[PDB]
Write a protein that binds this ligand. Structure first.
Ligand SMILES: C=CC1=C(C)[C@@H](Cc2[nH]c(/C=C3N=C(/C=C4\NC(=O)[C@H](C)[C@H]4CC)C(C)=C\3CCC(=O)O)c(CCC(=O)O)c2C)NC1=O
Ligand SMILES: CCC1=C(C)/C(=C/C2=NC(=C\c3[nH]c(/C=C4\NC(=O)[C@H](C)[C@H]4CC)c(C)c3CCC(=O)O)/C(CCC(=O)O)=C2C)NC1=O
Ligand SMILES: CCC1=C(C)/C(=C/C2=NC(=C\c3[nH]c(/C=C4\NC(=O)[C@H](C)[C@H]4CC)c(C)c3CCC(=O)O)/C(CCC(=O)O)=C2C)NC1=O
Ligand SMILES: CCC1=C(C)/C(=C/C2=NC(=C\c3[nH]c(/C=C4\NC(=O)[C@H](C)[C@H]4CC)c(C)c3CCC(=O)O)/C(CCC(=O)O)=C2C)NC1=O
Ligand SMILES: CCC1=C(C)/C(=C/C2=NC(=C\c3[nH]c(/C=C4\NC(=O)[C@H](C)[C@H]4CC)c(C)c3CCC(=O)O)/C(CCC(=O)O)=C2C)NC1=O
Ligand SMILES: CCC1=C(C)/C(=C/C2=NC(=C\c3[nH]c(/C=C4\NC(=O)[C@H](C)[C@H]4CC)c(C)c3CCC(=O)O)/C(CCC(=O)O)=C2C)NC1=O
Ligand SMILES: CCC1=C(C)/C(=C/C2=NC(=C\c3[nH]c(/C=C4\NC(=O)[C@H](C)[C@H]4CC)c(C)c3CCC(=O)O)/C(CCC(=O)O)=C2C)NC1=O
Lengths: 160, 161, 259, 47, 146, 161, 160, 161, 161, 51, 161
């Protein structure tokens, strides 16, 4: 969160929170309701984002569903959509947090080691999350999908 | 560490659920109290030196501690206690402004009772000093924010004791 | 107790729990698994689907003139195939790579000779380097002890035993504090002097890295060279410093080599 | 590019997306010692 | 302790010649001592990686591990490569350069600011060599959150 | 640490004797089993990744542990878990190839139970993961070498339990 | 032992044993019975090596034998040959170990400090071990006494 | 640590008193004995190696420790043994020349009994070695200074036992 | 506790299987060695007093321990010492006759090292006393049974050390 | 640790002089005089050519 | 426990010696101070009540401790505190009259700091109460005997702190 980050940064320098830092927390806590609506919309539209994003993923990338592929079968495809559901939930956490700290610590720290331990191509993961970014930007406003879409952009930048 | 927001995402995350209306009520509670926390942190940042001066003047001076043989008797040890008090005030402000005392669990109260029982710092007098900072600080920030700072100073005092 | 709960013992997935893994409660759903061992089996059955047979019968009696049966012969080839173990898919299959015949046997002489000769290579590298490093180090500490030992080093225990090292091995004599404590001086003006003659000038074999070269091939003849520049500046009408006169004489030393 | 622990080709010395601020933020600061990090004193300023 | 009882003889005699000629800075001496087989035999061999963290920070920085994230950081470094990377990261850290720089041997210090640093170094330096195999700081407590 | 050879020289040395026929029989035993151990360590060296992948797939996946709430839920904890498994495989190979589990006493099992009971790592699941590595590894190296590897994996499991 | 000189190596590199190292282990475990022949011969001929090496030592180096020498006296002379017996036994341990670790850790680690604390000239110890090297090379074959004699050479390089 | 002077300043300081006639009598005592302590430390500095050699020859000579299996049996353990006698002699000299055994409390006797009971070092043989250093040292420095060294060697012997 | 039989039923039980030929071979091994274990326990039962007397006479008497200042100097301590040697002999006989040292894990070695390091009992001397009981007892029961008693006395000595 | 260090007894010590032998004799083959058996006899290799 | 006489017989006994002139000088010292100890113990026995009332009236009353929420708030806790004071005074008298604080090691300070840190008894206020009993007691028994009781009370205060 922004509170946690300000605290941590301040803690490193062993000093009280700076006026500039303090001003941001005011802007954050007053921008609250707008964000709740943003995570409310991505919360209540999750099934279309995960299914439609999964469809654009597998249609763009037939290699994963090819015989001998990681995503082959019904069970494995269900596990693949399960993970896209995870990262959509984490993005909503990052939106209400006003920072990627929740997303980064739940989802991104050590992700490459896990998917390399699973045999999963992580570029396919990033293509899946980019597909959900396109669907989720189709569900939102201009400035709103700018913001939420940039949280998706951070997860894409963590995968690549 | 964690703030109140991170704690909500911890409970909602560890259930596997998304954000339901209860967690959004908790986020609304924090976002209502936000500005109050901000100005309280501003004022404490402003008058930390004054607060330390008044709480040491109330709680510690002209006693056996600053008389020779007490633990504050030298200039190095006077400085050490004064410096120590500053840390309690600073991390109590962090705990106030996060809305969650996890910081005091991580960076303050860990090993502190073993430190003071190792050196020979009186725990009693320290607790009295922290409560003096609680009263002065509550006098500066007012009623509401003084209750909030009161829970974190009392958290550190419950940690030492 | 006779029944004890070792975590080593509990294979069943109680601790890490998956709803899907389960006991075979009903006949329906064998589909999901088959038995792998003889102990896991149906009451009248076998690990494979077959009726159990006790495999004990009456051996045909033979004449006493007929030679008796031998226990260690290769089992008949027909027997193995009837159990089915020859096929790779069968569980009990034994890979031909895991036979003891696939090994180099240790008792054989030619493998021992050839393989000792294989052993010696990877060792003469590192063994050579370690020995040479010991020799260089030897020269190094002998010259270090010869150059002199400072007061602070001689107070330390290591220095005390390095001073003894020099004494027991006749490398040099090292000045050490007197049984009283005041430093052993030859001339009472300056501390820590030593006797200088005719043994400083004899070269010791422990200083030289090279034991092999023993013959100097020339004769040296000394003369006086004019020394030009490098002649040190001297103060007029006063006693010059000792070092300055030494530099003046070091500058004026010429060497001829006659082969 | 060092030796990878688990999986193949990844598992180097820094875990991917780990924090420099968690390690670098927490500093070890001998007050009355050589200043490792910036150290404030409330009562340092001369009277 | 002194180098005499756990060594045969000269071993790394080169550093003695190379350091008394002042070509080699004190840091490079500390690195090449930290990376030798001798240092493996003493401190990396009979102790687990957590104890190897703790000893290594004691030797090369003069203090205990400060938080949990340094313990994970140093574990991954130890597991990923080995002791050589680990000593190179301890010496080439911001901390070691700030405190010691090029020309100062590391010394025992009493850290004050973070967590249990003062107490844990007091548990370390009050322990002699081989006084117990038991680890002083295995980890820190269960912190809520991630 | 010590191998079987070092252990023989420990007993023969600590009696003051030289090498009698019993100690030479023990060294002949080890030198007979040497090649088998070598090729087993070669195979495990080849397929470490697939051992850890198949053993995690058997023992830990699709359970409460990797579901939220579980110890392995975050990517940080998943990676630390498979890292830990790698250590168990690596040092179990060292213990196999030395012929003496003293390595596991010195560098693995020391303080590990206090560490996992400190952090919150479930011992049960760890042991079941190690036994999954035992079954997969025995499947790779075969019967005899699988008995050798099994003894050392069972040594670590006996250590944590 | 040679086996240890690999597990420590790739342990500190935190990897499995290297292929090149593995070949040496195979060459070691196949060279075993020749090594046990060598240490068998030096085992059963120890009295000749200690006695005859002590004779060549005292005949080359009459310093110690003489009164006022470190080894002078009946009890003292016996101890001297007792130490030669120690090194000879150690050489045999180093032969069956396939490495000088046994020789180094039982005999060589801190040897200079001990004999300097006893007043013993360590050069006479090295001359004694060289004498036992000459006798032990007289009792063996060509390549055989090359190998065993080189273990003796390691001990000489540690004494000097 | 502290010497006799520092200890006087500690007691007088910690009572807040000045230096009265008693404390000046203690400082007179130390300043009378100072030169004797200096020449004693000079002679011990001169003959340390022979003190350790003669004391090992008295105390550990003709003993089972030398025989296989004893604790001094190897070269590494012999060197560690005589190394520890070097520590005892040297810190005993520091304690003599300070006039206050606080050095021995801080830097020697702390954790040493736990160390020797951990390693397997016989305490009895150690104490007899220290007493052999006490007899040889008293023979070198004489009667008075032998009494002074006798209180510090006896302090170490009382610390280990 | 458990004997060899109970251990067989533990392995066979915890696999769920019945008794296969391996487990029956282990029970045949124990039932072959049974009579020898019986007569050995009979002999030790006969001559317990003389075992403890001869082993104390070999290992502990006329030393620093029974001299003043030593651990066994007072009668109270002498009697407690020989009382403990009686426990070591008794439970070593139980361990021999069970064929499984689990008894020594449950009722002897648990907390004993903390107890003797609490009281001041030297572990070294204790171990040497137990090994003296091993030599005397092996002299009474003979070669084979002395090897069996040897593994259990060595088990207790490995426990304390 | 067979040697008596922890229990400090002066009387029991290793044989260093010719006079010592009266007090004790060797019991095992490994404890032996150079050239002797554990009993007092010259060592014989016990290997010969079978007829 | 032990008195000064038993301590002399401990040192003389543990050396194996009999009584030399130094130990007889120590016995003469104790036997000179004997009657002083007796009448001091008589007077403290007489006025225990008043020592406790006066010391509680000086040190503890009319503060946060007897105000609600302090540790002496309920009657049960008031009586337990005065009770504790009675034990400190009684065992301090035993320690005075033995001439050796071993009693306070055995029967008072054992586990007392774990007790008070378990319950939540303030150690500071307890130490202040004990020092109040030290001043009052020294005022009753006089200068010499007040120094002696001073040692025992300071011994208990050094034990708690
Ligand atoms: C600072 C002042 C200064 C000098 C004045 C010179 C003097 C000088 N000349 C030579 C050396 C020499 N000088 C000459 C010169 C001669 N050849 C002849 O036919 C003539 C007789 C003569 C010139 C007129 C020669 C030939 C040598 C070499 C001699 C030889 O190697 O045979 C050397 C010996 C070193 C060398 O080989 O260079 C020196 C010190 N050097 C100095 O540093
Ligand atoms: C909250 C953060 C978080 C994430 C993301 C996470 C992922 C995760 N993904 C897994 C498997 C998997 N994940 C995938 C994913 C994919 N396959 C493809 O080809 C595509 C590129 C991609 C889908 C878009 C597949 C196929 C598996 C199973 C592979 C196998 O078991 O063989 C597993 C193995 C066991 C289990 O799922 O229960 C975990 C733990 N865990 C976490 O804690
Ligand atoms: C070889 C020497 C050695 C070992 C073995 C070792 C283990 C070890 N495991 C750790 C954590 C961990 N270990 C696990 C392990 C598991 N989680 C699961 O669900 C599985 C069942 C199980 C593995 C089979 C996890 C998840 C953590 C991370 C806990 C956390 O910090 O968040 C940590 C804390 C540091 C960190 O990783 O962040 C250490 C130090 N350390 C060493 O130095
Ligand atoms: C297994 C490794 C190992 C070794 C080698 C070893 C040596 C050793 N040599 C000793 C003495 C000695 N060693 C020597 C040896 C010699 N004198 C000479 O002039 C010759 C150069 C040389 C014989 C070749 C002598 C004279 C002494 C006794 C010196 C004295 O006591 O004054 C002692 C003193 C006490 C005792 O022997 O019991 C030890 C411990 N200890 C070990 O644990
Ligand atoms: C001044 C501060 C100080 C002291 C005194 C000290 C003692 C000390 N003695 C040690 C070991 C030892 N100490 C001895 C001592 C003895 N062996 C004998 O037989 C003799 C009877 C006896 C000496 C009189 C031996 C043999 C060891 C080595 C044990 C081993 O590691 O193998 C060790 C372990 C480190 C090592 O040497 O390898 C320490 C730390 N350390 C300190 O920092
Ligand atoms: C301070 C209290 C105290 C006492 C009394 C004590 C006695 C004691 N007496 C012993 C032996 C002995 N004590 C005796 C005594 C006697 N033999 C007779 O026939 C007579 C009746 C009697 C002499 C008057 C004998 C013969 C032995 C040795 C028996 C043997 O070893 O076989 C031993 C065995 C080892 C050793 O002496 O060092 C101790 C410890 N220990 C103590 O700590
Ligand atoms: C909740 C249970 C509880 C009770 C009841 C309680 C009583 C209590 N009564 C006190 C004093 C006292 N209480 C009295 C009471 C009386 N005087 C009379 O003559 C009357 C009979 C009576 C009033 C009805 C007086 C006079 C004192 C003070 C006496 C003195 O200080 O000299 C004190 C001394 C210090 C202080 O008050 O702060 C306590 C702690 N404490 C407790 O925790």
């Amino acid at each position: 969160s922004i509170v946690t980050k300000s605290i941590v940064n301040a803690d490193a320098e062993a000093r009280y929170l700076s006026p500039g830092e303090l001003e941001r927390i005011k802007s954050f806590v007053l921008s609250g309701q707008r964000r709740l609506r943003i995570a409310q919309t991505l919360t209540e539209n999750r099934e279309m984002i995960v299914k439609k994003g999964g469809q654009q993923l597998f249609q763009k990338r037939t290699d994963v569903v090819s015989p001998g592929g990681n995503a082959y079968g019904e069970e494995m495809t269900a596990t693949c959509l399960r993970d896209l559901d995870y990262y959509l939930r984490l993005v909503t956490y990052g939106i209400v947090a006003g920072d990627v700290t929740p997303i980064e610590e739940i989802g991104l720290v050590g992700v490459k080691e896990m998917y390399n331990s699973l045999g999963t191509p992580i570029s396919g993961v990033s293509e899946g999350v980019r597909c959900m970014k396109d669907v989720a930007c189709s569900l939102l406003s201009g400035e709103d999908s700018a913001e939420a879409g940039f949280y998706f952009d951070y997860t894409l930048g963590a995968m690549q | 560490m964690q703030d109140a927001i991170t704690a909500v995402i911890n409970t909602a995350d560890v259930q596997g659920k998304y954000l339901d209306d209860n967690s959004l009520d908790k986020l609304r509670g924090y976002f209502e109290t936000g500005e109050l926390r901000v100005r309280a942190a501003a004022t404490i940042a402003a008058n930390a030196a004054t607060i330390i001066k008044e709480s040491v003047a109330k709680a510690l001076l002209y006693s056996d501690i600053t008389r020779p043989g007490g633990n504050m008797y030298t200039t190095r040890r006077y400085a050490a206690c004064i410096r120590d008090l500053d840390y309690y005030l600073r991390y109590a402000t962090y705990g106030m402004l996060a809305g969650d005392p996890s910081i005091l669990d991580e960076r303050v109260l860990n090993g502190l009772k073993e430190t003071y029982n190792s050196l020979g710092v009186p725990i009693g007098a320290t607790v009295q000093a922290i409560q003096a900072m609680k009263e002065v600080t509550a006098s500066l920030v007012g009623t509401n924010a003084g209750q909030e700072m009161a829970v974190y100073f009392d958290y550190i005092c419950s940690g030492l004791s | 107790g006779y029944g004890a709960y070792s975590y080593i013992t509990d294979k069943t997935k109680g601790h890490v729990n998956q709803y899907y893994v389960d006991k075979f409660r009903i006949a329906s759903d064998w589909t999901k698994g088959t038995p792998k061992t003889q102990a896991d089996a149906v009451l009248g059955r076998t690990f494979k689907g077959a009726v159990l047979v006790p495999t004990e019968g009456i051996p045909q009696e033979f004449d006493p003139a007929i030679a008796p049966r031998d226990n260690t012969v290769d089992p008949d080839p027909r027997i193995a195939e009837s159990e089915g173990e020859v096929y790779p898919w069968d569980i009990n299959y034994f890979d031909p790579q895991f036979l003891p015949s696939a090994y180099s046997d240790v008792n054989d002489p030619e493998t021992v000779d050839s393989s000792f000769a294989d052993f010696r290579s990877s060792m003469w590298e590192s063994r050579r380097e370690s020995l040479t490093a010991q020799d260089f180090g030897a020269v190094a500490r002998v010259q270090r002890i010869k150059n002199g030992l400072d007061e602070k080093y001689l107070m330390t225990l290591d220095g005390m035993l390095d001073a003894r090292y020099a004494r027991f091995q006749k490398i040099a004599e090292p000045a050490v504090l007197s049984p009283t404590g005041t430093p052993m001086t030859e001339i009472p003006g300056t501390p820590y002097l030593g006797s200088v003659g005719a043994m400083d000038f004899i070269a010791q074999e422990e200083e030289s890295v090279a034991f092999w070269k023993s013959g100097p091939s020339t004769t040296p003849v000394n003369y006086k060279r004019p020394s030009g520049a490098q002649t040190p500046n001297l103060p007029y009408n006063t006693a010059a410093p000792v070092a300055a006169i030494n530099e003046a004489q070091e500058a004026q030393k010429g060497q001829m080599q006659l082969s | 590019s060092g030796r990878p622990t688990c999986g193949e080709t990844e598992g180097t010395e820094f875990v991917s997306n780990a924090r420099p601020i968690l390690v670098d933020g927490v500093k070890v600061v001998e007050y009355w010692g050589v200043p490792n990090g910036p150290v404030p004193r409330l009562f340092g300023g001369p009277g | 302790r002194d180098i005499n009882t756990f060594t045969v003889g000269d071993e790394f005699h080169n550093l003695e010649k190379a350091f008394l000629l002042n070509e080699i800075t004190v840091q490079e001496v500390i690195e090449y001592l930290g990376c030798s087989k001798l240092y493996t035999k003493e401190f990396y061999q009979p102790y687990p990686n957590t104890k190897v963290i703790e000893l290594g920070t004691k030797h090369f920085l003069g203090r205990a591990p400060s938080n949990q994230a340094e313990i994970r950081y140093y574990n991954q470094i130890l597991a990923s490569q080995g002791q050589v990377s680990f000593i190179k990261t301890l010496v080439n850290s911001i901390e070691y350069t700030a405190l010691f720089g090029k020309n100062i041997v590391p010394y025992h210090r009493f850290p004050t600011l973070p967590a249990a640093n003062f107490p844990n170094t007091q548990k370390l330096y009050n322990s002699l060599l081989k006084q117990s195999t038991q680890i002083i700081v295995p980890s820190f407590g269960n912190s809520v959150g991630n």
